[PDB]
Symmetry: C2
Amino acid sequence: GPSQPPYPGDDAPVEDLIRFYDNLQQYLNVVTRHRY
Amino acid sequence: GPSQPPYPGDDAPVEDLIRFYDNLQQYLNVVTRHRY
């Protein structure tokens, strides 16, 4: 939701990076009011 | 491309966060061979 998802370093495994992608997409869809 | 995009903290402004979203999407599309 309206919370910045945890970033486990740049060497984070792609699956958890995709996990971050999902959470970031959700976050952005919230904060940007789904304008994008 | 095949490089982990820079993350300027959790308080990063949403526009640069969207910028990170684009670069992360591109990165994931590369690393995952566009399987997702």
